Amino acid sequence: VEIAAGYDGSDQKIFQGLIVKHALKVTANGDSMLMLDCRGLATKLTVGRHNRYFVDTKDSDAIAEIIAQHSLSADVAATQVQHPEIVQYYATDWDFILSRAEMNGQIVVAQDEKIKVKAPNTSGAPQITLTYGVNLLELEAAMDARHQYQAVKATSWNYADQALVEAEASEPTVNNQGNLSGRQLAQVIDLSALELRHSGLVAEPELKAWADAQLLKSRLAKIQGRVKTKGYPDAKVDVLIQLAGVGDRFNGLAYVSGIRHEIVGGAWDTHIQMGLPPQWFYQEVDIIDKPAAGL
Amino acid sequence: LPGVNGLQIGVVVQLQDDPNGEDRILVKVPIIDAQAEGIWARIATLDAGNNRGSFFRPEVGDEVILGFLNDDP
Amino acid sequence: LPGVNGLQIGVVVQLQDDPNGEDRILVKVPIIDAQAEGIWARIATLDAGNNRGSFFRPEVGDEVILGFLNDDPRDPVVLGMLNSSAKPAPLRATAENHRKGFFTRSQMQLTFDDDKKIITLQTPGGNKVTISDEDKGITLTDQNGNT
Amino acid sequence: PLEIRELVIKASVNEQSAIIAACVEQVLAILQEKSER
Amino acid sequence: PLEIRELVIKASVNEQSAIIAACVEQVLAILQEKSER
Amino acid sequence: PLEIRELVIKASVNEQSAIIAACVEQVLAILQEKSER
Amino acid sequence: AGNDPNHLGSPLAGGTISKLAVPQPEVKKIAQPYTSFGGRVKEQPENFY
Amino acid sequence: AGNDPNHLGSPLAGGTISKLAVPQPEVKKIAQPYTSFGGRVKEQPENFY
Question: Which residue of E has its CA nearest to D28?
Answer without folding.
Answer: E27
